[PDB]
Each structure stands twice: as C-alpha cells, then as structure tokens.
C-alpha cells in the first residue's frame, strides 16, 4: 500500500481531486493520499513541506493551477521532470471526427525553445534562443524507446525540422538514431514536423509513439488532444529524475464553476489511471479506466462540457457505482 502526494490545485481543482480520491476508494486501490498545497515563496521555490513529501512518495497527482513565475515550471525544475508523456486514445462515448487515435507524444521538457533566454538585440530586433544539448536529447530518446518497449508499442517516430535547423534538430535526431540502433526491436522512423501535422489531421492511425523536442511536443500534444475531445479528457504525466513522476490535468482552473459541482474529473482521473499503470497497479488501472469509459459511453451523467446536463457528483457517483460492479 503506497502513498501519493496530492496537489488539488485551484478552482475546480479540489472538487475533481475529491472525485478521483472517491473513485479510487470505490475501487479499493492500495493508494493513500497526502494533500499538499504548493505556493511559490521566496528564499522562488515551492514550499518544501511538499518538496519533502514528494521526494519521499515519488508519485504525485496534480490538479489545475492558476496563473509570479510559472508554478508548473517550478515543479518542472524542482524534480527535474524532463519527459512529458501524453497518451491520446479516442473515447467511444465521446465521438469526434477522429475515432481511431492511439498515439503517445513524448516531449522533451527541459530545454529547446523554452530555454528562458531572449534578448532585445536592438530595439525592434529580438532574438529567442532554442537550446538543444547532447545529454537531454539522449535521455529523452532513451525514455521514448524504453516507454515503447515497456508499454508494448511498436513504432517510434522522431519529429524534427532538421532540414531548417540543421545543428539543433540534427543533434536531437542524431541521439534518437543512436538509441534506435541499440533498441532495434522497437521500429524507428523520422519525419518532418510539418509532414506530421499534415498527415495527423488526415489519418492519425498511422502514428504510434512520437518523440520530439520541447516546442514541437507542446504543439503536437495539444493537436492530438483536439483529435479526441480536448484537454477536459486528456491524461498527462511528467516523469523526472530520481524516479519521480507527477501526473496532472492540463485543462484550465475553471473558477466560475469552481464550487458549483459541474466540473469534469475525467482528465485528472485518466491521469490517475496513467499513474496507476506507471506504479504497476494494472488491475486497478483497468477497472477505474473501464468504469469511466462505460460512464461516458452511457451517457446519462455526461457533465455539461461533454454535452450533457448533469453535475460532477452524478458523474462521479456513477463511476464509483460501476467500478464497484467490476469485482
């Protein structure tokens, strides 16, 4: 029975984190929580009550935070969360024009176009620095191939603009190619960013695991979320150094339904499922996952953002009810 740091976040945050914990309870998941606010304080750091707690538990689950530096950026730097993982799979109860999406975007999360470095060269001339290093590219590439093996994925595509950015993207592509030659049971191709966008909105089923540097993954991960219904239903995890992982919602704070019981917990719930699979609790993952899918499929308790007329508590209750049926 393991312990997980829980950061309910803001707005609808605490509501949906209570939903997740309640559903986890219905499922009898061997998981206990450790509620921890995080608020940027000076010394800019996260309150090390939580830093201590997460360094112990390793596993974390995080709600939406509101937007003076980015607190997601602080946690990113604090735990060295270098891999952003986004599995996008179509939801049978929620139909979009894309019904056969099963993609994992693996996004380098430390450098690239998010170096933090810009210069006003001269008034009206600005330079932004994209940073690619041999080490971060090697690590993200090793993570992608191990992820492909450890989740029985067959293909890994490196996405890049190395025709245009020969030295930066070309270095990233060189490291992927190097890991590809060592992990040859996972099949490897390379593809220009714009060809990936072009083909993605036409036939997303041709793609499996996608690994790319920071900005491309930032854009592509949201593109694929749009294929399957948006950020309200998209799980996400940031995997870091010292084994740490934090799984998170990427939707907004939604302060105006903040306490009106109309939030949608699906995304955080599916991130929690992702957490469970990361921890090895596959059975509890499968049951909670199926219960949420069946609820969405029904779908009498579709929350208002999924086109239904039903409060969060109804949606949450039914998932608990259904996961209780999977005995």
């Amino acid at each position: 029975v393991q312990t997980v740091t829980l950061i309910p976040g803001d707005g609808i945050g605490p509501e949906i984190s209570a939903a997740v914990m309640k559903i986890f309870d219905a499922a009898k998941a061997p998981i206990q929580w450790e509620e921890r606010n995080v608020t940027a304080i000076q010394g800019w750091m996260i309150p090390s009550e939580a830093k201590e707690s997460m360094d112990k538990n390793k596993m974390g689950l995080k709600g939406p935070l509101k937007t003076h530096p980015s607190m997601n950026l602080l946690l990113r730097k604090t735990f060295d969360l270098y891999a952003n993982v986004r599995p996008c799979v179509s939801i049978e109860g929620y139909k979009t024009p894309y019904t056969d999406v099963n993609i994992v975007t693996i996004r380098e999360n430390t450098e690239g176009e998010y170096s933090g470095i810009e210069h006003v060269i001269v008034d009206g001339v600005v330079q932004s620095i994209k940073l690619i290093t041999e080490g971060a590219s090697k690590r993200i590439a090793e993570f992608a191939f191990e992820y492909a093996r450890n989740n029985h994925r067959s293909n890994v595509t490196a996405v890049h603009k190395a025709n245009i950015m020969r030295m930066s993207d070309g270095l990233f592509l060189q490291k992927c190619r190097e890991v590809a030659e060592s992990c040859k049971d996972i099949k490897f191709n390379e593809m220009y960013l714009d060809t990936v966008c072009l083909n993605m909105v036409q036939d997303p089923s041709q793609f499996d695991v996608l690994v790319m540097p920071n900005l491309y993954g930032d854009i592509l991960s949201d593109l694929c979320a749009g294929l399957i219904g948006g950020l309200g239903v998209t799980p996400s995890g940031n995997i870091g150094a010292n084994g740490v992982a934090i799984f998170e919602s990427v939707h907004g704070t939604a302060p105006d339904i903040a306490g009106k019981d109309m939030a949608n917990p699906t995304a955080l719930l599916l991130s929690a499922v992702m957490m469970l699979r990361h921890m090895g609790l596959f059975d509890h993952a499968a049951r909670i996952e199926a219960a949420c899918f069946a609820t969405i499929k029904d779908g009498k308790s579709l929350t208002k953002d999924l086109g239904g007329n039903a409060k969060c508590s109804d949606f949450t209750e039914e998932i608990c009810r259904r996961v209780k049926d999977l005995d």
Binding site: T96, P97, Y98, E113, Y114, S115, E118, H119, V120, I121, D123, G124, V125, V126, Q127, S128, I129, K130, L131, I132, T133, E134, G135, K161, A162, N163, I164, M165, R166, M167, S168, D169, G170, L171, L173, L193, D194, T195, C197, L198, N199, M200, V201, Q202, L215, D218, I219, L220, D222, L223, A225, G226, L227, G230, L231
Partner: protein, 332 residues
C-alpha cells in the same frame, strides 16, 4: 508574351512542370518558361543563378528543392535561400473546402499569411561547448509590420472581417511579443477588421475541431509552417492547395505544402491540382486573368468528378488522366 522562370525542383516537381506546360500550350497561354535547375551540390552556383533569373523575370513557378538534412549546417536549404535573398516576405495560402473532396470538416475558408523570411528560418546556430547547440529565432519590427500590413490589407480587399495572430508570446514574451505588438500597431489602422490573437497550441486544437471560426490568420515563420500543413490536411491534403510567395517586386508560386514527393515521383500518381492552381495564381499575377480563370475553372471542374481523383484524395486516377480531363474542359 511573358517570360517566367521555372525551377523544376526535385521529386514530383519536374513531371508536374511538364503537365503545366501542356496545359499552357493547349490553352494557348502567352508564356514562355525559362528553366533553371538546382542540383544536389553544396556549392551555391545554381541557387544564385536562379535568384538572378528571377530578378530578371520577376516571376517564377517552382517545385520543391530537396533539402538533405544529413548534410552539414553549411549546406543550407535552397528553398529558404531563394525565399530570403529575393525577400519574398509573405507566404500566402488559401485553404477552402472543395465540395468534391469530402473530408472530416466542411465550410473551411482560411487565408493564411505567413512571415516568410525571418523567425526560426534564419539559419543562425552555433555550438558554444561540445554538445551544446543554440539556434537563434529572430523576430524584427520591420518584418513583423510588413507581414501584418499584408494580412490586414489582404483581409480588407477580400471582404474578410477577422484577422487572428498566432503566437507563443506566453513563453516567448519578447520575440513573439514584439510580433504581436506589430500586429496591434497595424490593427489600429484597420478598425473595421476584428483583430484577435491565439496561442499556436490552442490554434491547432481549434483547427481540428472547429476550423470554421478562422478567417485571416497571420503568424511568424514556423507557426505558419505548422498551420499551413494542418489546414491543407483538413481540406484534403498536399495535392490541393497552391502557395504564393510575395515580395515587393517579385512573386514565386509553388504548392502550399512544399513537398518534394520523392516516394511517389515518376509513378504518374501525383495530384496536379495544387501545381495547376499555383500556375493560375501566377497567370493572375501577370494580369492574364482570362487564361487563369479558364484553367482554374477546368481544374476545379475535374475535381467535381470523383472518378478523376488521384490516390491522395481517395481515388485511383493517374496524373495524366487528370491532365486530360483538365484539357477537355478547356474549350476554345
């Protein structure tokens, strides 16, 4: 008669240029094509000739020149070199739903105005220490105002109502921020145009769910690469949309998505629609509108027959069959 430079390029470029010539002969178009080739060689002799020919003729029609990204950084994209030396600052594509090409979305009608010389395409990178590379995205006020001026004037002359600037100014506060700021400066002179802004991440999510909200879109170089290709996908793929590159004095026409097409070259399967439509934008630019309208209506009509469709739009027709059905509709 006019003289136009033609760069066959690589992949499917040469074979499609031939079909362009055939259609021009059969339509009795008063245009002579002066060809310049660009080989695979690191030396810039050929690309320099092509630039100078385009300076002489001021109008070109080009295929895509292959960029081997395994060559050293010193060997730069010949497409980008030509674009930047001629200072063709506006890449303009018009993505519109084709009624005979049924995709997942209908009623798309987006004008994309992309900054075509600056940004992530400046070819500025270095290695400070071993295995630490920096690449320098450059945003300037003069080019950002230039592109925004094109986008607003285009919107107003076209009867469009809204301009949306696409950016990442929440992370690239100064670079993208300056780009936004120049858009806002221009917007002040076009108060009848609704001006909005959207983060590139969100833009892609909106494009694949409700692309009908967009009208005119303006953006720096890389974001335009991304958005051009999403939108081309939504309306049916790379074989359909023409692309224009405008400088103050020069104009170069090509397919919107700039694909070489090596894997389908010389198999008589490439869709010729985008290339023909670009050749019609060139004819329009030369003020030979009557020739443009004639070829454009034939090309759009052959698209209404699902049987003339090439495989990129779900059909099984070859390139030469499509060219025949274009020539058949050209009546004189």
């Amino acid at each position: 008669r006019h003289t136009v430079t033609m760069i066959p390029g690589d992949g499917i470029g040469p074979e499609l240029m031939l079909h362009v010539k055939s259609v021009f002969r059969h339509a009795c178009v008063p245009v002579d094509f002066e060809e310049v080739h660009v080989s695979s060689n690191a030396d810039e002799e050929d690309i320099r000739n092509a630039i100078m020919a385009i300076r002489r003729n001021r109008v070109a029609l080009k295929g895509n020149i292959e960029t081997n990204h395994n060559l050293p950084p010193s060997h730069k994209s010949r497409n980008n070199i030509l674009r930047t030396s001629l200072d063709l600052y506006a890449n303009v594509i018009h993505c519109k739903s084709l009624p005979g090409v049924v995709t997942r979305h209908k009623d798309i009608d987006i004008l994309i105005v992309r900054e075509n010389t600056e940004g992530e395409y400046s070819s500025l990178e270095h290695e400070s220490v071993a295995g630490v590379v920096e690449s320098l995205k450059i945003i300037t006020k003069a080019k950002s105002l230039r592109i925004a001026e094109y986008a607003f004037k285009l919107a107003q002359e076209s009867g469009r109502k809204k301009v949306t600037a696409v950016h990442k100014a929440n992370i690239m506060k100064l670079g993208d921020g300056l780009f936004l700021q120049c858009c806002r400066e221009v917007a002040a002179r076009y108060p009848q145009i609704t001006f909005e802004n959207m983060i590139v991440d969100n833009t892609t999510m909106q494009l694949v769910s409700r692309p009908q909200q967009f009208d005119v879109m303006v953006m720096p170089n890389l974001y335009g690469n991304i958005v051009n290709n999403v939108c081309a996908g939504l309306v049916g793929g790379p074989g359909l949309v023409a692309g224009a590159n405008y400088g103050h004095v020069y104009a170069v026409f090509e397919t919107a998505t700039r694909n070489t097409g090596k894997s389908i070259a010389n198999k008589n399967i490439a869709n010729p629609t985008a290339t023909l439509l670009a050749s019609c934008m060139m004819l329009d630019h030369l003020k030979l509108h009557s020739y443009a309208t004639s070829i454009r209506k034939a090309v759009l009509a052959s698209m209404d027959n699902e049987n003339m469709h090439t495989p990129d739009i779900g059909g099984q027709g070859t390139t030469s069959e499509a060219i025949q059905d274009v020539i058949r509709h050209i009546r004189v």
